[PDB]
Amino acid sequence: MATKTSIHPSVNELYQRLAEDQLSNCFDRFDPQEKIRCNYCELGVSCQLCSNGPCRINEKVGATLGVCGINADGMAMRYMLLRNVMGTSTYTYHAYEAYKTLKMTALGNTPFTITDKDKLYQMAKDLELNTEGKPEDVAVRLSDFLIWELYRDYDEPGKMIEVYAPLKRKEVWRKLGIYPAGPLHELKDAAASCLTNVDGDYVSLATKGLRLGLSCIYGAQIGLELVQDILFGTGMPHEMDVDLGIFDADYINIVFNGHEPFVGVALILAAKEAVNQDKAKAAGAKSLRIYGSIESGQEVVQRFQKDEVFRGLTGNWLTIEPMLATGAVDVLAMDMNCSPPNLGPLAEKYGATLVSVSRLVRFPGIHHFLDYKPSEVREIAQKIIDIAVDSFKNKRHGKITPKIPANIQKAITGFTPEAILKALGGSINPLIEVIKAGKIKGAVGLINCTTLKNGPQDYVTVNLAKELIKRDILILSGGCGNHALEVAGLCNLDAINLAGPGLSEVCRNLNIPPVLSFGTCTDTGRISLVVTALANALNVDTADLPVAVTAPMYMEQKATIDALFALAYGLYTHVAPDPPVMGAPNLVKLLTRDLPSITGGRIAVGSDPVKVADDILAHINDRRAKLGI
Amino acid sequence: ATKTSIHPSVNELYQRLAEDQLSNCFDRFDPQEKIRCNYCELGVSCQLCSNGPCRINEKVGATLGVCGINADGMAMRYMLLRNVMGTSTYTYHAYEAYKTLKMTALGNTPFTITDKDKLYQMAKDLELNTEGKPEDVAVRLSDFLIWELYRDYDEPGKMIEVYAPLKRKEVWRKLGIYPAGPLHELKDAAASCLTNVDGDYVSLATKGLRLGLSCIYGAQIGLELVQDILFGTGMPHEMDVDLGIFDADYINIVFNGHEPFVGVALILAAKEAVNQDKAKAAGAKSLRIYGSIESGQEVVQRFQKDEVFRGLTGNWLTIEPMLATGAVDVLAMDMNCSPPNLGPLAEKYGATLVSVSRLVRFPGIHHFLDYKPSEVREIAQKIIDIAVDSFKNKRHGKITPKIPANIQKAITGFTPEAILKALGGSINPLIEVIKAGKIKGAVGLINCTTLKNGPQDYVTVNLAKELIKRDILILSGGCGNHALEVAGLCNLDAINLAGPGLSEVCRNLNIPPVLSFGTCTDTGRISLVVTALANALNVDTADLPVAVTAPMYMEQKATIDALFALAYGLYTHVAPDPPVMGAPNLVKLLTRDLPSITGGRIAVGSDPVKVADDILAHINDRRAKLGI
Ligand code: SF4
Ligand code: SF4
Ligand code: FES
Ligand SMILES: [Br-]
Ligand SMILES: [Br-]
Ligand SMILES: [Br-]
Ligand SMILES: [Br-]
Ligand SMILES: [Br-]
Ligand SMILES: [Br-]
Ligand SMILES: [Br-]
Ligand SMILES: [Br-]
Ligand SMILES: [Br-]
Ligand SMILES: [Br-]
Ligand SMILES: [Br-]
Ligand SMILES: [Br-]
Ligand SMILES: [S]
Ligand SMILES: [Xe]
Ligand SMILES: [Xe]
Ligand SMILES: [Xe]
Ligand SMILES: [Xe]
Ligand SMILES: [Xe]
Ligand SMILES: [Xe]
Ligand SMILES: [Xe]
Ligand SMILES: [Xe]
Ligand SMILES: [Xe]
Ligand SMILES: [Xe]
Ligand SMILES: [Xe]
Ligand SMILES: [Xe]
Ligand SMILES: [Xe]
Ligand SMILES: [Xe]
Ligand SMILES: [Xe]
Ligand SMILES: [Xe]
Ligand SMILES: [Xe]
Ligand SMILES: [Xe]
Ligand SMILES: [Xe]
Ligand SMILES: [Xe]
Ligand SMILES: [Xe]
Ligand SMILES: [Xe]
Ligand SMILES: [Xe]
Ligand SMILES: [Xe]
Ligand SMILES: [Xe]
Ligand SMILES: [Xe]
Ligand SMILES: [Xe]
Ligand SMILES: [Xe]
Ligand SMILES: [Xe]
Ligand SMILES: [Xe]
Ligand SMILES: [Xe]
Ligand SMILES: [Xe]
């Protein structure tokens, strides 16, 4: 049937049950779309932006330009920028709601508290805010300042990019003129440029894409992740259970799924109440348990420990459909991507109830809607707990047969730059010395999603991670590719012996895995804080560091914006499968050949793990040779 | 080319463009027709993630995309993502206008405060502080409107309470479509269109309605009122249109786009004697400034013709033939439409392309002058200088001019104040002429132009003729308004082409049967007319004998006004068909089920007679329900 499924045997076992129930799934839907693939759109030489279209680029038949007059390069780059507007919008949405959450928490209208006060005061100092009074007043000040960072216009200088970016990179950006405004104004200008007969210059549209990436990282991601640190704590390494074997059908299981962790931690807090556990027990279940899915669950497992209520991480987005096939989910609380639009019939067949906690998430089949609100989240949480208890009693218990796979995997989560400092001994210099000694050739930022385009689920990512660590290359993993690596067993101590000589030796001496789970794609900025550190200790530019960035199985634009950032950051950025720009030769030449003389980085292609690893190692060794190491 | 224009001048200049073996929109349309994608034409395509691209095809088994979305959600999501761009353009213009007003209040621009009466009346309607001198009040109004731009979800708006009718506001409350600021709304909509987020076409259509609402009451009304306060409220006056206004012996600077600040600065600087002496020293008779598309339309709404400013050239499909005249020296571009292939044409005909905005970029532009209110005085001068050299070294003596002879008269500058003055200071006379059957109803023709459903401006002009013959008044905005001005439907001569009652009313009031109200950005301005008639009757806007048509729409600045008209509860005609016709449930919601939700509905068709007949049938249905 489906030609490509997954590398995880649990996901395969559950896809087989999905297919046995004759329910549609992504794997089964891939091939019918393969039958009628459009090479125009796949090469990026098609457009749909105006009524004179739809236009295709075909010079051998006489259609050199669109009806407007744009060429293939401008077409591809403009479409890319247009959809990257969406990723910037998602990150800015997350950041704004995080700042609102911190503001409403500092004034006592949330079930949340200010956990990391050290980080709050350090941010207040570095951003030159007023530190007088209570910590909550400083939290309100930081909320307002980061909202202002969101709101910055084209003519107002920002402070986050001055604090969290190295000197030479800021020099490169100011000499390129790609110093961005606030992410709001930046995405506004990008979308306004993508309109018909506005911006049709592929160089200019790529410049605006780099501007949008910088806007996203320094105006949204860093601030939101540091505010989440202040709220729920800075992550420290701890052991965690992943893969779908963590499910138990005898419990009222609630799964939160999205990107923002507020609903999930509110559910954990409300489930710690004895009254709700007594409700779960009086309903006929053992107790009430909460599970974390994709990036929301990743955020939560970065900072929270495994107990009787919180049981771990389910997987990546391609695991959501088979997860419902377990027949063990009572509530799937959804706040952002991914919430696949055909989840209705699947939850109806397996006895699950779908609840959306966001005004962004809507699709056919949802049972309840509880738009997020910091002053309401507590109540929201409770309502979800009252929904599951009802669902469990009326739909799943004694009616749905569970099919929970046996695969449970150990994974070390919660790695942060502070955790790197702590494991090294408070200083980054030992990492410097093991990099200069040749034991660790370099570090790779694997900020990745997952997709069925360039192979089965997580094949490219996991096999490329193995190939990378085999060549003494450390990996900082974020995104759904990080979920893939945690499930595949590469994020625990047993994985030490899957690394090459130097990397395995150093990781055994430090008692850390060769793949450090830094969390989500939102942590890309956080990962930059590592590279910036490596750039500040050496007084060398980021483009000269033996570092690399890879998204071996990207899907939508939350990773394309991180790739555009890494390009503006001046890094070798591998992206697979091919973004739809290959029908534009000039843009391809700019992205893969010209940019190293503009920003410093370039775009790498390919889905072969061995060859991608070889090219990454070759770039790292070039950087080493020019560093004298 | 199988399709060109109904205007003789543009056909002649297309002939010259074809003589020079140069590419143009008319010629580029046909090669695209041989290989049209029916999928994208019907809106059953998607390119949002790497598991794609996907197409909806139930026969071969592709009922859903790899994500799981259906055709309805796919089409509506692509429509919402596209209209994000139009919302962004409107928000960009509004924010630049607010910054321009505030910087003018501090004495950093060549501008001033022309309409202080409107400044203070709007300050009082918004309950602002009237204290101090007009500069302070202007600063306060700018800050308030900027706050409107940044408004989020728990901050109720004040523009929508002041400028919207009662029953429409109650309907928007019970529907839950009361929008935030346009910035937050466009960001929320763009985030909803990401893969595996919002895949319900009903939710996406509700978000499109919210987007249009946040665009009209969060940007358009305020930006046009601010531009009025800066450059005076427009009043009806004579204007020359079509490309016959060009004279090759002068140094011609044409401002083209949407935002008119660069145009006003250019006019002001060109009126200076030193710049006219610079023009004369180059061998030219004098120095003239011309308006093009929507920026031109703003200026011609507010400015009369004189020795310097000459009027409007045409609409967007007239840009390439305009360069073909061989008379342009500088084409200053501030926004859309700026065709991305103007380089070779400007090289052939000796014109210099200048971009006065960081949004406009394409190969061949010779100078970039990103607009800043505190620099617009030095930009204009530079432009003028760039013209002088470009006159001496490129055009004068080498380029053969081919200026067409067609010139038309148009009465421009029709505003709600203009209607109120022409009616004697009250809305009751219009109520009487409508209730008596003289004017069956009014129609807002807010439109672009395109080659999709016919030659340039064919459907627009013919539909306007049929409407005015059916005793239906027309308020025209956008490039359709330019088409009507060039065709000669906005002067008194057009009264002979109106029906009996409409011609009687127009002869009594001395107005044309088509009122040139400005740009698509003036849709909200037109929304103030309907609202007024809704408040005098105490009826909802869905009960009024009004309608809205975009018979040759092109991009999303028109589709967002159509989404507003839908949320406004109006019969909204749009042609050609937007890419949704492959989504049966979405077409059902837009064309059939929306009357029970908002009151309005989408109408389709490019046959002028049938479209006018359906519009008149809707107006007569409303009339019968009103008892008139
Ligand atoms: S913007 Fe240009 S290329 Fe795109 S559909 Fe319109 S005419 Fe065709
Ligand atoms: S968003 Fe969905 S329908 Fe669109 S290309 Fe991706 S998988 Fe296909
Ligand atoms: S699917 Fe329409 S051009 Fe590719
Ligand atoms: Br094809
Ligand atoms: Br401090
Ligand atoms: Br402060
Ligand atoms: Br050409
Ligand atoms: Br086809
Ligand atoms: Br005074
Ligand atoms: Br003036
Ligand atoms: Br003079
Ligand atoms: Br300024
Ligand atoms: Br009025
Ligand atoms: Br009267
Ligand atoms: Br159709
Ligand atoms: S990602
Ligand atoms: Xe299904
Ligand atoms: Xe052909
Ligand atoms: Xe993309
Ligand atoms: Xe919020
Ligand atoms: Xe609370
Ligand atoms: Xe670039
Ligand atoms: Xe917490
Ligand atoms: Xe809130
Ligand atoms: Xe239920
Ligand atoms: Xe670090
Ligand atoms: Xe490390
Ligand atoms: Xe890295
Ligand atoms: Xe471990
Ligand atoms: Xe080590
Ligand atoms: Xe990075
Ligand atoms: Xe990219
Ligand atoms: Xe990336
Ligand atoms: Xe690329
Ligand atoms: Xe559209
Ligand atoms: Xe501005
Ligand atoms: Xe005010
Ligand atoms: Xe504001
Ligand atoms: Xe709707
Ligand atoms: Xe009128
Ligand atoms: Xe008046
Ligand atoms: Xe009326
Ligand atoms: Xe009207
Ligand atoms: Xe109207
Ligand atoms: Xe309107
Ligand atoms: Xe529309
Ligand atoms: Xe419209
Ligand atoms: Xe429609």
Numbering used by the authors:
A (entry chain A): 1 to 629
B (entry chain B): 2 to 629
What is written in the article reporting this PDB entry?
Potential gas channels around the hybrid‐cluster were calculated for the oxidized and reduced structures of CooS‐V Ch using MOLE. Additionally, we pressurized CooS‐V Ch crystals with Xe to probe hydrophobic channels. Using the anomalous scattering contribution of Xe atoms at a wavelength of 1.90 Å, 64 Xe atoms were located in the four molecules of the asymmetric unit in which each molecule has approx. 15 Xe atoms bound. When the four molecules with their bound Xe atoms are superimposed, common positions of Xe atoms in the interior of the structure fit well to the calculated channel.
Here, we report on the structure and reactivity of such a deviant enzyme, termed CooS‐VCh. Its structure reveals the typical CODH scaffold, but contains an iron‐sulfur‐oxo hybrid‐cluster. Although closely related to true CODHs, CooS‐VCh catalyzes neither CO oxidation, nor CO2 reduction. The active site of CooS‐VCh undergoes a redox‐dependent restructuring between a reduced [4Fe‐3S]‐cluster and an oxidized [4Fe‐2S‐S*‐2O‐2(H2O)]‐cluster.
